[PDB]
Amino acid sequence: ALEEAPWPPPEGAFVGFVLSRKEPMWADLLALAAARGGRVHRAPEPYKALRDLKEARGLLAKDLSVLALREGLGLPPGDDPMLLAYLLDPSNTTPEGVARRYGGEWTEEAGERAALSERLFANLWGRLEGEERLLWLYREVERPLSAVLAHMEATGVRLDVAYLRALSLEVAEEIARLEAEVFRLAGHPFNLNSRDQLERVLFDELGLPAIGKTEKTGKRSTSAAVLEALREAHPIVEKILQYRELTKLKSTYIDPLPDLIHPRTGRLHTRFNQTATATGRLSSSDPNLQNIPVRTPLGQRIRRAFIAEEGWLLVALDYSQIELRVLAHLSGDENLIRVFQEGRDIHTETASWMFGVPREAVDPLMRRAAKTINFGVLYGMSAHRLSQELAIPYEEAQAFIERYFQSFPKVRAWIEKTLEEGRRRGYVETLFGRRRYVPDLEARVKSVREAAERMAFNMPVQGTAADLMKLAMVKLFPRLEEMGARMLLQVHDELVLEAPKERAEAVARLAKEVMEGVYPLAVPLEVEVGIGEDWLSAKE
DNA sequence: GACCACGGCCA
DNA sequence: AACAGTGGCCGTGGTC
Ligand SMILES: O=c1[nH]c(=O)n([C@H]2C[C@H](O)[C@@H](COP(=O)(O)OP(=O)(O)OP(=O)(O)O)O2)cc1-c1ccc[se]1
Ligand SMILES: *P(=O)(O)OC[C@@H]1CC[C@H](n2ccc(N)nc2=O)O1
């Protein structure tokens, strides 16, 4: 049905490729093809014909650009129909889904994938006509950001492997101690990693009361919430909790990561999935580097393993109270804008209230616990749950919630303005125009409607925070190449850079001004910046 | 071996 | 466990 003109393909053609696995850094390029005007050009040798291309254009262009960089080839990713459909509707997350929705079939052949990329682009670009606010996000944010992400995935990050190997044995012993002590209290051994077996030990053999049930099957839950309430009911809970922390950090971080070091680059390579969340945030996978531990003392020792190359330093930049500043600009609340206009720290103030210490006596562990509460209360946590997390009576948890939103009376008016427009328009949008469709705002079941409501007014705040970060990544990346610095990781409101040790302080100051002034708001955006040889030393 | 659902937990 | 929201990976249990 399509003409099979031979390689080389024309210019501005749409590419179609097949990988041996989903990870472009680890994938073997199995087939390559291009399409334009109906014609489909199939590469004889994929690695040889990959050099004939001058732009990566089509579905998942970023992934092909990452494998190209893996081969020392500069093949920038261009237009991607996935970015058009993702801006039209964040529910369009995969090539299979967008194919079933807007037309065509996602197959496993490079030629058919090439032809589908051209057909999908004309359709989605036609629908995006008129949606100029979304076209601006496409032209100015999403499309150039893929090229930035391609270099981040290709560069990778250095990992102190011998440090994690020693950390594995160091924690392996501490796990055996707790494991043996939990068997002593239970009177018999069992599999502590099996929630079903722990359920019988805690709730049938012991007289411990079951606090709640699981969702799908209705079993007696052994989650950290149930156990945290049973710390005084039995000493076995105290050691089961210490056991969960270690095995989580060992089986997910300390042990898996050193085995993912790439052979050719000697670095760890993640994937930054650009069309994966409903709010416009990025997501990381294979391995996920956006959930490296940082809270517990042992978790912070895992960030020490993320190091710069010899003669380099890591530059970390983190937005301060970012979504609270976003809410101040969206709500227009005079008292909240006044807070960031006077340099006040909401997270430090909340910790000062929990621990009965002044703002000066608050430490980072206290301030991190207050962030969990400040954003929980903001996005609709119940007064009953808040009372249990803070161990305060239900009456005090109500007053804290009312005082929270009465300190900024316009934020609740803004939540209603967003909800009201949500049910009228059928979608909420960020400050830049990125939409999320939430259709259950008029559901008749109170639980389903209220769940849709909490998702509804969260997306503008979190989505605008995501957009300001993407805009900075698009503006900051070219200024780094002219300084010999690299862009490595993005953690939602945080950028991790890598610069030579002599230019590190110059890169830290430049990135600070770019991020702070990426888009001026009614409040100033303040960025905390630190330099170190490792990730933990730079976040300080 | 490959794949999945579930509870559970990290940011 | 809950009227916080956004993600992704783990081991267990069970199938094909
Ligand atoms: O529980 C959390 N729910 C949540 O929605 N978010 C959002 C909102 C925040 O704006 C942004 C960056 O978070 P984060 O950079 O950590 O804090 P931020 O608000 O910028 O204050 P600062 O400490 O950076 O100055 O993620 C974060 C949460 C947590 C992070 C850490 C522990 Se719970
Ligand atoms: P981590 O270094 O403490 O957090 C880094 C990023 C910022 C927001 C995101 N996050 C963390 C924790 C929770 N509960 N929810 C989030 O969205 O991780």
Coordinates of C-alpha atoms (C1' of nucleotides) and ligand atoms in Angstrom, one line a residue:
Chain A
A1 CA 0.0 0.0 0.0
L2 CA 3.1 2.2 0.5
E3 CA 6.0 2.7 -1.9
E4 CA 9.2 1.0 -1.0
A5 CA 11.9 3.5 -2.1
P6 CA 15.4 2.5 -1.0
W7 CA 17.5 4.0 1.7
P8 CA 18.6 6.8 1.9
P9 CA 15.3 8.5 2.8
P10 CA 14.3 12.1 2.0
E11 CA 14.6 15.0 4.4
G12 CA 12.1 15.7 7.1
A13 CA 11.1 12.1 7.0
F14 CA 9.5 10.2 10.0
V15 CA 11.6 7.5 11.5
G16 CA 10.5 4.0 12.6
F17 CA 12.7 1.8 14.7
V18 CA 12.7 -1.5 16.7
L19 CA 14.7 -2.0 19.9
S20 CA 15.6 -5.3 21.5
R21 CA 14.4 -3.9 24.8
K22 CA 12.7 -0.8 26.2
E23 CA 15.9 0.8 27.5
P24 CA 17.6 2.7 24.7
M25 CA 20.9 2.7 26.5
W26 CA 20.8 -1.1 26.7
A27 CA 18.9 -1.8 23.5
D28 CA 20.1 -3.4 20.3
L29 CA 18.9 -1.5 17.2
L30 CA 17.1 -4.3 15.3
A31 CA 15.4 -2.4 12.5
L32 CA 15.3 1.1 11.1
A33 CA 13.0 2.7 8.6
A34 CA 11.7 6.1 7.4
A35 CA 8.5 7.4 5.9
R36 CA 7.4 10.5 4.0
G37 CA 4.7 11.0 1.4
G38 CA 3.6 7.4 1.7
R39 CA 7.0 6.1 0.8
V40 CA 8.7 3.8 3.3
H41 CA 12.5 3.4 3.3
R42 CA 13.8 0.3 5.0
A43 CA 17.4 0.3 6.2
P44 CA 19.6 -2.6 5.0
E45 CA 21.9 -2.3 8.1
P46 CA 20.3 -0.3 11.0
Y47 CA 23.6 0.8 12.6
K48 CA 25.1 1.9 9.3
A49 CA 21.9 3.6 8.1
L50 CA 21.6 5.4 11.5
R51 CA 24.4 7.7 10.3
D52 CA 22.4 8.7 7.2
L53 CA 19.7 10.5 9.4
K54 CA 20.1 14.1 10.4
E55 CA 17.1 14.4 12.8
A56 CA 15.1 11.9 14.9
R57 CA 11.5 12.6 14.0
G58 CA 8.6 10.3 14.9
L59 CA 7.1 8.3 17.8
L60 CA 9.5 8.1 20.8
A61 CA 12.1 10.2 18.9
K62 CA 13.9 10.8 22.2
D63 CA 14.6 7.1 22.6
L64 CA 16.3 6.8 19.2
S65 CA 18.3 9.9 19.9
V66 CA 19.5 8.3 23.1
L67 CA 20.8 5.2 21.3
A68 CA 22.4 7.5 18.7
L69 CA 24.3 9.3 21.4
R70 CA 25.3 5.9 22.7
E71 CA 27.1 5.4 19.4
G72 CA 28.8 8.9 19.5
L73 CA 26.3 10.2 16.9
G74 CA 24.5 13.5 17.2
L75 CA 20.9 12.8 16.1
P76 CA 18.7 15.3 17.8
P77 CA 15.1 14.3 18.5
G78 CA 12.5 16.5 16.8
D79 CA 8.8 16.3 16.3
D80 CA 7.0 13.5 18.3
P81 CA 3.3 12.7 17.9
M82 CA 3.4 11.4 21.5
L83 CA 4.1 15.0 22.7
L84 CA 1.1 16.3 20.7
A85 CA -1.3 13.7 22.1
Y86 CA 0.2 14.1 25.7
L87 CA -0.5 17.8 25.5
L88 CA -4.0 17.2 24.1
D89 CA -4.7 14.7 26.9
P90 CA -2.2 13.4 29.5
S91 CA -4.0 10.0 29.3
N92 CA -2.2 9.5 26.0
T93 CA 0.9 7.9 27.5
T94 CA 2.0 5.1 25.2
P95 CA 2.2 4.6 21.4
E96 CA -0.3 1.7 21.7
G97 CA -3.0 3.8 23.4
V98 CA -2.7 6.8 21.1
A99 CA -2.9 4.4 18.1
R100 CA -6.2 2.9 19.3
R101 CA -7.6 6.4 20.1
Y102 CA -6.7 8.5 17.0
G103 CA -6.2 5.8 14.4
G104 CA -3.8 3.1 13.1
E105 CA -2.1 0.1 14.7
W106 CA 1.1 0.1 16.7
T107 CA 3.0 -2.9 15.4
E108 CA 6.5 -4.4 15.7
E109 CA 7.9 -3.6 12.3
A110 CA 10.1 -0.5 11.7
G111 CA 8.5 0.3 8.4
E112 CA 5.0 0.3 9.7
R113 CA 6.1 2.2 12.8
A114 CA 7.7 4.8 10.4
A115 CA 4.4 5.2 8.4
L116 CA 2.3 5.4 11.6
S117 CA 4.5 8.2 13.0
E118 CA 3.8 10.3 9.9
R119 CA 0.0 9.5 9.9
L120 CA -0.3 10.2 13.6
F121 CA 1.5 13.5 13.4
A122 CA -0.7 15.0 10.7
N123 CA -3.8 14.0 12.7
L124 CA -2.6 15.3 16.1
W125 CA -1.0 18.4 14.7
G126 CA -4.3 19.1 12.9
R127 CA -6.2 18.8 16.2
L128 CA -3.7 21.0 18.0
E129 CA -4.4 23.8 15.5
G130 CA -6.2 26.6 17.3
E131 CA -4.9 25.3 20.7
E132 CA -2.2 27.9 20.6
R133 CA -1.6 27.7 24.3
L134 CA -0.8 24.0 23.8
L135 CA 1.2 24.8 20.7
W136 CA 3.4 27.1 22.8
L137 CA 4.0 24.3 25.3
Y138 CA 4.9 22.1 22.4
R139 CA 7.2 24.4 20.5
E140 CA 8.8 26.2 23.5
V141 CA 8.8 23.4 26.1
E142 CA 8.1 19.8 25.3
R143 CA 9.8 19.4 21.9
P144 CA 13.1 21.1 22.9
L145 CA 13.0 19.4 26.3
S146 CA 13.2 15.9 24.6
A147 CA 16.7 16.9 23.2
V148 CA 17.7 17.9 26.8
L149 CA 16.4 14.6 28.2
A150 CA 18.2 12.6 25.5
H151 CA 21.5 14.0 26.6
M152 CA 20.7 13.4 30.3
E153 CA 19.8 9.7 29.6
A154 CA 22.9 9.3 27.4
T155 CA 25.3 11.0 29.9
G156 CA 24.3 9.0 33.0
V157 CA 25.6 9.5 36.5
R158 CA 28.7 7.9 38.2
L159 CA 28.0 5.6 41.1
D160 CA 30.4 4.6 43.9
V161 CA 30.0 0.9 43.4
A162 CA 32.6 -0.3 46.0
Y163 CA 30.9 1.9 48.5
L164 CA 27.5 0.3 48.0
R165 CA 29.1 -3.2 48.0
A166 CA 30.5 -2.5 51.5
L167 CA 27.1 -1.0 52.4
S168 CA 25.4 -4.2 51.4
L169 CA 27.4 -6.4 53.8
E170 CA 27.2 -3.8 56.5
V171 CA 23.4 -3.9 56.4
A172 CA 23.2 -7.6 55.6
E173 CA 24.4 -8.3 59.2
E174 CA 22.0 -5.8 60.8
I175 CA 19.2 -7.5 58.9
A176 CA 20.1 -10.9 60.3
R177 CA 20.2 -9.5 63.9
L178 CA 16.6 -8.1 63.6
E179 CA 15.4 -11.2 61.6
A180 CA 16.6 -13.6 64.4
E181 CA 15.2 -11.3 67.1
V182 CA 11.8 -11.2 65.4
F183 CA 11.7 -15.0 65.3
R184 CA 12.5 -15.0 69.0
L185 CA 9.5 -12.9 69.8
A186 CA 7.2 -14.8 67.4
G187 CA 8.4 -18.1 68.9
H188 CA 9.0 -19.6 65.5
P189 CA 10.6 -18.6 62.2
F190 CA 8.6 -17.4 59.2
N191 CA 9.0 -15.3 56.1
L192 CA 9.0 -11.6 57.2
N193 CA 8.9 -10.5 53.5
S194 CA 5.5 -12.3 53.1
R195 CA 2.8 -9.9 54.3
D196 CA 0.4 -12.9 54.4
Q197 CA 2.6 -14.8 56.9
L198 CA 3.2 -11.7 59.0
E199 CA -0.6 -11.3 59.1
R200 CA -1.0 -14.6 60.9
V201 CA 1.8 -14.0 63.3
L202 CA 0.6 -10.6 64.4
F203 CA -3.1 -11.0 64.4
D204 CA -3.9 -14.7 65.0
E205 CA -1.0 -16.1 67.1
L206 CA -0.5 -12.8 69.0
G207 CA -3.4 -10.9 70.5
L208 CA -2.6 -7.8 68.5
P209 CA -5.7 -5.9 67.2
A210 CA -6.0 -5.4 63.5
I211 CA -6.5 -1.7 62.7
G212 CA -7.5 -1.7 59.0
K213 CA -8.1 -3.7 55.9
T214 CA -6.4 -3.8 52.4
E215 CA -8.1 -2.6 49.3
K216 CA -8.6 -5.3 46.8
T217 CA -8.8 -8.4 49.0
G218 CA -9.7 -7.1 52.5
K219 CA -6.9 -8.8 54.4
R220 CA -5.7 -7.5 57.8
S221 CA -3.1 -4.9 56.7
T222 CA 0.5 -5.1 58.0
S223 CA 1.4 -1.7 56.6
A224 CA 3.6 0.8 58.4
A225 CA 0.5 2.7 59.4
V226 CA -1.1 -0.2 61.3
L227 CA 2.2 -1.1 62.9
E228 CA 3.1 2.5 63.9
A229 CA 0.0 2.5 66.0
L230 CA 1.0 -0.9 67.6
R231 CA 4.5 0.2 68.7
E232 CA 3.4 0.0 72.4
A233 CA 1.1 -3.0 72.1
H234 CA 4.0 -5.5 71.4
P235 CA 7.8 -5.2 71.1
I236 CA 7.8 -7.4 67.9
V237 CA 6.3 -4.4 66.0
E238 CA 9.3 -2.3 67.0
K239 CA 11.7 -4.7 65.3
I240 CA 9.5 -5.4 62.3
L241 CA 9.5 -1.7 61.6
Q242 CA 13.3 -1.6 61.7
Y243 CA 13.3 -4.6 59.5
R244 CA 11.1 -3.1 56.8
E245 CA 13.3 0.0 56.5
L246 CA 16.5 -2.1 55.8
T247 CA 15.1 -4.7 53.4
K248 CA 13.3 -1.9 51.4
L249 CA 16.5 0.1 51.0
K250 CA 18.6 -3.1 50.4
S251 CA 16.4 -4.9 47.8
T252 CA 15.6 -1.7 45.8
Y253 CA 18.7 0.5 46.0
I254 CA 21.9 -0.9 47.6
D255 CA 21.9 -4.2 45.7
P256 CA 20.2 -3.5 42.4
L257 CA 21.9 -0.3 41.4
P258 CA 25.6 -1.4 41.2
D259 CA 24.6 -4.2 38.7
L260 CA 23.1 -1.6 36.3
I261 CA 26.4 0.1 35.5
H262 CA 26.7 0.3 31.8
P263 CA 29.9 -1.3 30.3
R264 CA 30.9 1.3 27.8
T265 CA 30.1 4.4 29.8
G266 CA 30.8 3.1 33.3
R267 CA 27.8 5.1 34.5
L268 CA 24.2 4.5 35.6
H269 CA 21.6 5.4 33.0
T270 CA 18.0 6.1 33.7
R271 CA 15.1 6.9 31.4
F272 CA 13.2 10.2 31.7
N273 CA 9.7 9.4 30.4
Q274 CA 8.2 12.6 29.0
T275 CA 4.6 11.5 28.6
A276 CA 3.9 9.4 31.7
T277 CA 2.1 11.5 34.4
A278 CA -1.3 13.2 34.5
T279 CA 0.0 16.6 35.7
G280 CA 2.9 17.1 33.3
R281 CA 5.6 15.9 35.6
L282 CA 8.4 13.8 34.3
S283 CA 8.9 10.2 35.5
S284 CA 12.1 8.2 35.8
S285 CA 12.5 4.4 35.3
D286 CA 14.9 1.6 34.7
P287 CA 16.2 2.5 37.3
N288 CA 14.0 5.2 38.8
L289 CA 16.3 7.9 40.1
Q290 CA 13.5 10.2 41.4
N291 CA 13.0 8.1 44.6
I292 CA 16.5 7.7 46.0
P293 CA 16.2 7.6 49.8
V294 CA 17.1 10.9 51.6
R295 CA 15.1 10.8 54.8
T296 CA 16.4 8.0 57.1
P297 CA 20.0 8.2 58.2
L298 CA 20.8 5.0 56.3
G299 CA 19.0 6.3 53.3
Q300 CA 21.2 9.4 53.2
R301 CA 24.2 7.1 53.0
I302 CA 22.8 5.9 49.7
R303 CA 23.0 9.4 48.2
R304 CA 26.7 9.5 49.1
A305 CA 27.1 6.7 46.4
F306 CA 26.1 9.1 43.6
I307 CA 29.3 10.9 42.8
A308 CA 30.8 13.1 40.2
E309 CA 33.7 12.1 37.9
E310 CA 37.3 12.7 38.9
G311 CA 38.0 16.4 38.7
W312 CA 34.2 17.2 38.6
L313 CA 31.7 18.3 41.2
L314 CA 27.9 17.9 41.4
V315 CA 25.7 21.0 41.4
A316 CA 22.2 20.6 43.0
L317 CA 19.5 23.3 42.7
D318 CA 16.2 22.9 44.5
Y319 CA 13.2 25.3 44.4
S320 CA 12.1 26.5 47.8
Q321 CA 8.5 25.7 48.7
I322 CA 7.9 25.6 45.0
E323 CA 4.2 24.6 44.9
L324 CA 3.4 26.9 47.8
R325 CA 4.8 29.8 45.7
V326 CA 2.8 28.5 42.7
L327 CA -0.3 28.6 44.8
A328 CA 0.4 32.2 45.9
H329 CA 0.6 33.2 42.3
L330 CA -2.5 31.2 41.2
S331 CA -4.7 32.1 44.2
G332 CA -3.6 35.7 44.4
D333 CA -3.9 35.5 48.1
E334 CA -2.4 38.7 49.5
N335 CA -1.4 37.1 52.8
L336 CA 0.4 34.2 51.0
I337 CA 2.2 36.5 48.5
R338 CA 3.2 38.6 51.5
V339 CA 4.7 35.4 53.0
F340 CA 7.2 34.8 50.2
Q341 CA 7.6 38.5 49.6
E342 CA 9.1 38.7 53.1
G343 CA 11.2 35.6 52.8
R344 CA 9.1 33.4 55.2
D345 CA 9.5 29.6 55.3
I346 CA 6.2 27.8 55.7
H347 CA 7.8 24.4 56.2
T348 CA 10.0 25.7 59.0
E349 CA 7.1 27.4 60.7
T350 CA 5.0 24.2 60.7
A351 CA 7.8 22.3 62.3
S352 CA 8.2 25.0 64.9
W353 CA 4.5 24.3 65.8
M354 CA 4.8 20.5 66.0
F355 CA 8.0 20.4 68.1
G356 CA 7.4 23.5 70.2
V357 CA 10.8 25.0 69.2
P358 CA 11.5 28.4 67.5
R359 CA 12.1 28.5 63.8
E360 CA 15.9 28.8 64.6
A361 CA 15.9 25.6 66.5
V362 CA 14.2 23.5 63.7
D363 CA 16.4 20.9 62.1
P364 CA 16.1 19.4 58.6
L365 CA 14.4 16.2 59.8
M366 CA 11.8 18.2 61.5
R367 CA 11.3 20.4 58.5
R368 CA 10.9 17.4 56.2
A369 CA 8.2 15.9 58.4
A370 CA 6.3 19.2 58.2
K371 CA 6.5 19.2 54.4
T372 CA 4.6 15.9 54.4
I373 CA 1.9 17.5 56.6
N374 CA 1.8 20.9 54.9
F375 CA 1.2 19.3 51.5
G376 CA -1.1 16.6 52.9
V377 CA -3.4 19.3 54.5
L378 CA -3.2 21.5 51.5
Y379 CA -4.5 18.8 49.1
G380 CA -7.3 17.6 51.3
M381 CA -6.2 15.4 54.1
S382 CA -8.9 14.6 56.5
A383 CA -8.9 15.9 60.1
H384 CA -9.3 12.4 61.4
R385 CA -6.1 11.2 59.7
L386 CA -4.2 14.3 60.6
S387 CA -5.0 13.8 64.2
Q388 CA -3.5 10.3 64.1
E389 CA -0.3 11.3 62.3
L390 CA 0.4 14.1 64.7
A391 CA -0.9 12.2 67.8
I392 CA -3.2 15.2 68.6
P393 CA -6.9 15.0 69.5
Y394 CA -9.4 15.3 66.6
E395 CA -10.5 18.8 67.8
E396 CA -6.9 20.2 67.4
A397 CA -6.5 18.7 64.0
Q398 CA -9.7 20.5 62.9
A399 CA -8.3 23.8 64.2
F400 CA -5.0 23.3 62.5
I401 CA -6.8 22.8 59.2
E402 CA -9.0 25.9 59.7
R403 CA -6.0 28.0 60.8
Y404 CA -4.1 26.7 57.8
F405 CA -6.6 28.0 55.3
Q406 CA -7.7 31.0 57.2
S407 CA -4.1 32.2 57.2
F408 CA -4.7 32.4 53.4
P409 CA -8.5 32.9 52.9
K410 CA -8.2 33.2 49.1
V411 CA -6.8 29.7 48.5
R412 CA -10.1 28.1 49.4
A413 CA -11.9 30.6 47.1
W414 CA -9.4 29.6 44.4
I415 CA -10.0 25.9 45.0
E416 CA -13.8 26.5 44.4
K417 CA -13.1 28.6 41.3
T418 CA -11.0 25.7 39.9
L419 CA -13.5 23.1 40.8
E420 CA -16.4 25.1 39.4
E421 CA -14.6 25.6 36.1
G422 CA -13.5 22.0 36.1
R423 CA -17.0 20.6 36.0
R424 CA -18.1 23.3 33.5
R425 CA -15.2 22.9 31.1
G426 CA -14.5 19.2 31.7
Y427 CA -10.8 19.8 32.4
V428 CA -8.5 21.9 34.6
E429 CA -5.4 23.6 33.1
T430 CA -2.1 24.8 34.4
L431 CA -1.0 28.4 34.2
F432 CA 0.6 27.8 30.8
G433 CA -2.5 25.9 29.4
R434 CA -1.6 22.2 29.9
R435 CA -4.9 20.4 30.6
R436 CA -5.9 17.4 32.6
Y437 CA -9.4 15.9 32.0
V438 CA -11.2 15.0 35.2
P439 CA -14.7 13.9 34.3
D440 CA -15.9 12.7 37.7
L441 CA -16.3 16.1 39.2
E442 CA -20.1 15.7 38.8
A443 CA -20.3 12.0 39.8
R444 CA -23.3 11.1 42.0
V445 CA -21.3 9.0 44.5
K446 CA -19.8 11.3 47.1
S447 CA -16.6 9.3 47.4
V448 CA -15.9 9.2 43.6
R449 CA -16.7 12.9 43.2
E450 CA -14.5 13.9 46.1
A451 CA -11.6 11.8 44.9
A452 CA -12.0 13.5 41.5
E453 CA -12.0 16.9 43.3
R454 CA -8.8 16.3 45.1
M455 CA -7.2 15.3 41.8
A456 CA -8.7 18.4 40.2
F457 CA -7.3 21.3 42.2
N458 CA -3.9 19.5 42.7
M459 CA -3.1 19.4 39.0
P460 CA -2.7 23.2 38.4
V461 CA -0.4 23.6 41.3
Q462 CA 1.8 20.6 40.7
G463 CA 1.5 21.0 36.9
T464 CA 2.6 24.6 37.0
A465 CA 5.6 23.6 39.1
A466 CA 6.4 21.0 36.5
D467 CA 6.2 23.5 33.7
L468 CA 8.5 26.1 35.3
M469 CA 11.1 23.3 35.8
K470 CA 10.8 22.1 32.2
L471 CA 11.1 25.7 31.0
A472 CA 14.3 26.1 33.0
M473 CA 15.7 22.9 31.7
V474 CA 15.1 24.1 28.2
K475 CA 16.8 27.5 28.9
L476 CA 19.7 26.2 31.1
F477 CA 21.0 23.3 28.9
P478 CA 22.6 25.4 26.1
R479 CA 24.3 27.7 28.7
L480 CA 25.8 24.5 30.2
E481 CA 27.4 23.3 27.0
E482 CA 29.2 26.6 26.5
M483 CA 30.7 26.1 30.0
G484 CA 31.6 22.4 29.7
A485 CA 28.9 21.3 32.2
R486 CA 26.4 18.5 31.9
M487 CA 22.8 18.0 33.0
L488 CA 22.3 14.7 34.8
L489 CA 19.1 14.3 36.9
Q490 CA 15.8 16.0 37.4
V491 CA 13.7 15.4 40.5
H492 CA 10.6 17.4 39.8
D493 CA 11.8 20.7 41.5
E494 CA 15.5 19.8 41.6
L495 CA 18.3 19.7 39.0
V496 CA 21.6 17.8 39.5
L497 CA 24.4 19.2 37.3
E498 CA 28.0 18.1 36.8
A499 CA 30.7 20.7 36.2
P500 CA 34.5 20.8 36.4
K501 CA 35.7 21.7 39.9
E502 CA 37.1 25.1 38.7
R503 CA 34.0 26.1 36.9
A504 CA 31.6 24.5 39.4
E505 CA 31.0 27.7 41.4
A506 CA 30.3 29.6 38.1
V507 CA 27.8 27.0 36.9
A508 CA 26.1 27.0 40.3
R509 CA 25.6 30.8 40.2
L510 CA 24.4 30.7 36.5
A511 CA 21.9 27.9 37.0
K512 CA 20.6 29.7 40.1
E513 CA 19.7 32.9 38.1
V514 CA 18.3 30.9 35.2
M515 CA 15.9 28.9 37.5
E516 CA 15.0 31.8 39.7
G517 CA 14.1 34.0 36.7
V518 CA 12.8 31.4 34.4
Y519 CA 9.3 33.0 34.6
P520 CA 8.6 35.9 37.0
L521 CA 5.5 35.5 39.2
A522 CA 3.8 37.5 41.9
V523 CA 6.2 35.9 44.3
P524 CA 10.0 35.4 43.8
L525 CA 11.2 31.9 43.1
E526 CA 14.1 31.1 45.4
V527 CA 16.4 28.2 44.6
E528 CA 18.7 26.5 47.2
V529 CA 22.0 25.6 45.6
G530 CA 24.9 23.5 46.9
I531 CA 28.1 22.0 45.6
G532 CA 29.8 18.7 46.6
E533 CA 31.6 15.7 45.3
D534 CA 28.5 13.5 46.0
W535 CA 24.7 14.0 46.0
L536 CA 24.3 14.3 49.8
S537 CA 27.1 16.9 50.1
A538 CA 25.6 19.1 47.4
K539 CA 22.0 19.0 48.7
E540 CA 23.3 20.4 52.1
Chain B
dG1 C1' 11.6 -18.2 32.1
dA2 C1' 7.9 -14.8 31.2
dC3 C1' 4.0 -12.3 33.1
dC4 C1' 0.6 -10.5 36.4
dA5 C1' -2.0 -8.8 40.7
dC6 C1' -1.5 -7.4 45.1
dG7 C1' 0.3 -5.2 49.3
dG8 C1' 3.8 -2.3 50.5
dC9 C1' 7.1 1.7 50.4
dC10 C1' 10.7 4.9 48.4
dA11 C1' 10.9 10.0 46.7
Chain C
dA1 C1' -6.5 2.4 57.8
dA2 C1' -8.1 7.1 56.8
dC3 C1' -10.9 13.4 52.4
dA4 C1' -3.6 14.6 50.5
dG5 C1' -1.8 14.5 45.2
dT6 C1' 2.1 12.5 41.3
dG7 C1' 5.0 8.6 40.2
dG8 C1' 7.9 3.5 40.0
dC9 C1' 10.1 -1.0 42.1
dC10 C1' 10.2 -4.4 45.4
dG11 C1' 8.9 -9.7 47.1
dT12 C1' 5.2 -12.8 47.5
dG13 C1' 1.8 -15.7 45.5
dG14 C1' 0.1 -17.8 41.6
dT15 C1' -0.1 -19.1 36.2
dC16 C1' 1.3 -20.5 31.8
Ligands
LIG1 O1 4.7 14.9 50.3 C1 4.9 15.7 49.4 N1 3.9 16.1 48.5 C2 3.9 16.9 47.4 O2 3.0 17.2 46.8 N2 5.2 17.4 47.2 C3 5.3 18.3 46.1 C4 5.0 19.8 46.5 C5 6.4 20.4 46.6 O3 6.4 21.8 46.3 C6 7.2 19.7 45.6 C7 8.7 19.6 45.8 O4 9.0 19.1 47.1 P1 10.3 19.5 47.9 O5 11.3 20.0 46.9 O6 10.7 18.3 48.7 O7 9.8 20.7 48.8 P2 9.4 22.2 48.5 O8 7.9 22.3 48.6 O9 10.0 22.7 47.2 O10 10.1 23.0 49.8 P3 11.8 22.9 49.8 O11 12.1 21.9 50.9 O12 12.3 22.4 48.4 O13 12.3 24.2 50.1 O14 6.7 18.3 45.6 C8 6.3 17.1 47.9 C9 6.2 16.2 49.0 C10 7.4 15.9 49.8 C11 8.7 16.1 49.5 C12 9.6 15.7 50.4 C13 9.1 15.1 51.5 SE1 7.3 15.1 51.4
LIG2 P1 12.9 13.8 48.1 O1 14.3 14.3 47.7 O2 12.6 14.1 49.6 O3 11.8 14.5 47.1 C1 12.3 14.9 45.8 C2 11.0 15.1 44.9 C3 10.3 16.4 45.2 C4 8.8 16.0 45.2 C5 8.8 14.5 45.1 N1 8.0 13.9 46.2 C6 8.6 13.4 47.4 C7 7.9 12.9 48.4 C8 6.5 12.8 48.3 N2 5.8 12.2 49.3 N3 5.8 13.2 47.2 C9 6.5 13.8 46.1 O4 6.0 14.2 45.1 O5 10.1 14.0 45.2

